[PDB]
Write a protein that binds this ligand. Structure first.
Ligand SMILES: Cc1cc2c3c(c1C)C(C)(C)CC=[N+]3c1c([nH]c(=O)[nH]c1=O)N2C[C@H](O)[C@H](O)[C@H](O)COP(=O)(O)O
Ligand SMILES: Cc1cc2c3c(c1C)C(C)(C)CC=[N+]3c1c([nH]c(=O)[nH]c1=O)N2C[C@H](O)[C@H](O)[C@H](O)COP(=O)(O)O
Ligand SMILES: [K+]
Ligand SMILES: [K+]
Ligand SMILES: [K+]
Ligand SMILES: [K+]
Ligand SMILES: [Mn+2]
Ligand SMILES: [Mn+2]
Lengths: 500, 500
């Protein structure tokens, strides 16, 4: 099966790429696996596959860390993401995000039901598993629980059957047969949950599939529109209907090649202690436990030699930066274009801990609008910050056509030199805020509201007559023939490879 | 003579360090020298010494580019700056800035007059030179003139004789015997100029010395206090009285080992076209010429085989970042401490194009103040932004004791995650602004006023009871013994030198 359609094939792809280290000696899921993974993520090393996890019983489970993290070289920096999508490993960010957006104007390709698959190789019923006995990792030393769920896909369906959502929300083990986790607005698992609670008749039928098709985990992490079933979007994106099998204890459908599947219910009434957890923005607040959603597990099914993917998230760079930030930015780029805003590209700079999105503007189009900074900043912020795709983003930086928004250094340069603090900015206090950012949920103001800003790094003449400067750089402040002479004589004179 | 006290010895030091490329074939001062230098600065290469400059006559002149730019390795990144100051080449930024501040609580060591020196090896009077005939560089393709002065020291003295200031302000050739340049408030050359214009009797006696003692060019680029003679400060800093010779046509004194010396006057009445110039913030605005100050040159003296230093300034990283930013930040650190503010360290991040300064706070001291963010932000901004040392800085970022302000990545992390836009910031509109930043002089508001902000990246509990988080990083979210186990087994398991 292809790597983008089968997690087990994706692991083999990473090996073939010389992008995997298989650790076959005993590794402790209490911190050690996540510590190795953390170091990998902070150094852009090869992904670790822990084949000998202390506490692994009857096939549950091996761990793959850092599945969507960065490689060291510039030439295949995003290779692990490209391997989720059948793209060449040298794919640019622009090409990855375009591939993630491509299904947005295609008909869905709904999934195909098959009668069985590898996820049915083993099962454990209600008397045979205990979630406290599995090798679930403690990921950070102060975490409030063992976070079994950092890279699986929650599957829930609207009561009317019309929308089936796939999404990554965190969850940790509560006891032998329950998990707790975050289920918060405006996320789709929350939106569906609310539908079931207003009906008031039963808990939400639920499954959580780990080690799903890599193309499906990518869509699970992208804020595609309300009401859209991720399976059909992935089908369109990949040009192939995904094969799903039915759960044994409910009528939801899971990828046939899922490594591990939990089946059960998400309660519409119960809660339990959840968190704290070491989070995307680089922090944990020890002892900051709050009630979260409560899931009951009725059944586990799994592949022989099952592998659990894990995100050891925190400071730069991991799946929470490469996937949450970049995929939000892709959806925001589309959203702006559909609102007739002249945006060509969008990216969430890593240097902003993916809290900013830089929006590249077609300034020829801007000029024809015959508008001003104040008006244009307000229009952009109202579109993005009132939409779910803007949830996690607190600062939008508008830049002209000379800036490559996928290059943090150039975004930082533009922001720092072209946006006058205050005067060139519009603050938004009456929009939903992202409470996980420290300055929101542990800050001086309301955890759930405001704290957002549009910073205009467009220069004045970019609204009127056109760019009126040249950069004081080697590229722009010397003629072509001189530049080429310099480069051709560089090593000859005494001064100092693309792949490496 | 030691390298920090003699420019010619400093060039030899850079060679011995394998930090120099001597180019002995013909190089054009029309762009080519500055293009090579620009590339050096954008790639942290070795400093270029152009020994065969097309148009060099009767010893005037060779060029050294990139004299205060960065080296490639992390271990001696600031080595070229250390070589200005007799510090080991591995010196940290903290050690360089401490050495620049050390004279601030020492008695001055005034200079020693000697009867001659190498700067008197050759002379040209009023009938023998023509500044349009020398190999003065065109540094950027759209510059409004040939900028002879990018790394020399202007010397002017108060009418009462009590203060002699040394400073770098840019100047370009106007005609055979004049230069034009920037003389703008609040700079000391401007402050002295104003004194002479209010007396109204004569133009300002003036000299411009190129290739001065490296310790003296550093102090020339630092905003030490009003009224303080840079020579005595350098004397104290170095522990040695500087040797100066008298000018031939005026009574000012120049370093004895200066490579080239211009003697003349700065007019109290005349102006001439000046600029545009490719500037520190990374831009040139072609055709943006304005009247600047006008200098008359009456005499040139120079060393045999004289060498002119040159800054090919613009985008990262050159002398305008490493010296203007860092030395302002050092003076701001001192200024805050003298105003009883609990600041331990200050640095202007390169990523902010040296427009921000990050101030590290002793949060134990902050806690004893029993204050709030709003009050503390106002107090810090009022101290810094009303002082000359704050002129070039438009954003101050306050951070707690965990952040290394000399590490841009950590400053960016703190800013982006701990400062809530708007609410955690105070804007300052009634302070002097730096017009050279594009968003000031080519922006939407007053070029000379406002546009400044204090951004508080201190978390709430840092004012009260103490830090209440741990970072979600390898350093902080795993115990010591585990971390060390991981590191000791890293290459054994399969994963990947300080000098490289
Ligand atoms: C890649 C990624 C995405 C996480 C995520 C992480 C990763 C690695 C974890 C598991 C490591 C940390 C926690 N995560 C949560 C999360 N969304 C959320 O609501 N709660 C979370 O707890 N997301 C973000 C979420 O998946 C996106 O917002 C999706 O758009 C949700 O899909 P939806 O649009 O269908 O609601
Ligand atoms: C390192 C450095 C400093 C420049 C400088 C450059 C460099 C490389 C140039 C020459 C390449 C670009 C232009 N420069 C100017 C300048 N100050 C100024 O007022 N006008 C300028 O034109 N300075 C900043 C100035 O030297 C500091 O502000 C000093 O504090 C001035 O000394 P003072 O405190 O005694 O007035
Ligand atoms: K999704
Ligand atoms: K602007
Ligand atoms: K000075
Ligand atoms: K704050
Ligand atoms: Mn969805
Ligand atoms: Mn001075």
């Amino acid at each position: 099966q292809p790597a983008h359609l089968c997690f087990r094939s994706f692991v083999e792809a990473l090996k073939v790429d010389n992008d995997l280290v298989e650790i076959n000696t005993p590794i402790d899921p209490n911190l050690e696996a996540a510590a190795i993974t953390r170091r990998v993520c902070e150094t852009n090393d090869k992904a670790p596959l822990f084949n000998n996890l202390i506490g692994m019983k009857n096939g549950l489970f091996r761990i793959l860390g850092a599945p969507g993290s960065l490689r060291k070289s510039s030439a295949d920096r995003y290779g692990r993401l490209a391997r989720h999508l059948a793209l060449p490993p040298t794919a640019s960010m622009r090409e990855i995000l375009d591939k993630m957006l491509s299904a947005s104007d295609m008909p869905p390709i709904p999934p195909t039901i098959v009668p069985t698959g590898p996820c049915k190789e083993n099962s454990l019923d209600d008397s045979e598993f205990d979630l406290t006995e599995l090798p679930v990792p403690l990921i950070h030393k102060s975490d409030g629980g063992k976070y079994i769920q950092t890279y699986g896909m929650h599957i829930v369906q609207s009561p009317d059957g019309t929308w089936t959502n796939w999404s990554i929300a965190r969850a940790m083990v509560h006891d032998k047969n329950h998990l707790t986790g975050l289920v918060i607005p405006p996320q789709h698992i929350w939106q569906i949950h609310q539908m079931w609670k207003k009906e008031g008749r039963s808990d939400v039928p639920w499954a959580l599939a780990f080690g799903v098709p890599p193309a499906a985990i990518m869509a699970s992490s992208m804020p595609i529109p309300d009401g859209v079933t991720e399976a059909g979007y992935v089908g369109a994106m990949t040009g192939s209907s995904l094969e799903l099998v039915k759960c044994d204890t409910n009528d939801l459908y899971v990828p046939a090649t899922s490594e591990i599947v939990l089946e059960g219910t998400l309660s519409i009434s119960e809660t339990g202690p959840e968190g704290p957890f070491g989070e995307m923005h680089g922090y944990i607040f020890p002892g900051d436990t709050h009630l979260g959603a409560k899931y009951k597990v009725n059944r586990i099914t799994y592949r022989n030699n099952a592998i659990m993917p894990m995100s050891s998230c925190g400071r730069l760079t991991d799946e929470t930066h490469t996937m949450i930030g970049s995929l939000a930015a892709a959806e925001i780029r589309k959203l702006c274009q559909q609102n007739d805003l002249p945006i060509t590209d969008a990216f969430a700079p890593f240097e902003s801990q993916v809290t900013w999105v830089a929006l590249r503007v077609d300034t020829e189009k801007l000029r024809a609008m015959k508008t001003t900074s104040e008006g244009f900043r307000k229009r952009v912020g109202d579109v993005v910050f009132n939409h779910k795709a803007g949830y996690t983003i607190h600062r939008l930086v508008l830049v002209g056509d000379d800036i490559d928004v996928y290059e943090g250094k150039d975004v930082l340069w533009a922001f720092s030199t072209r946006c006058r603090p205050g005067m060139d900015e519009t603050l938004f206090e009456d929009v939903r805020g992202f409470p996980l950012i420290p300055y929101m949920g542990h800050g001086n103001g309301p955890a759930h509201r405001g704290g957002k800003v549009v910073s205009d790094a467009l220069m004045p003449t970019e609204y009127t007559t056109g760019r009126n400067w040249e950069a004081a750089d080697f590229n722009q402040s010397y003629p072509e023939d001189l530049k080429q002479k310099v480069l051709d004589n560089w090593t000859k004179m005494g001064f100092s490879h693309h792949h490496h």
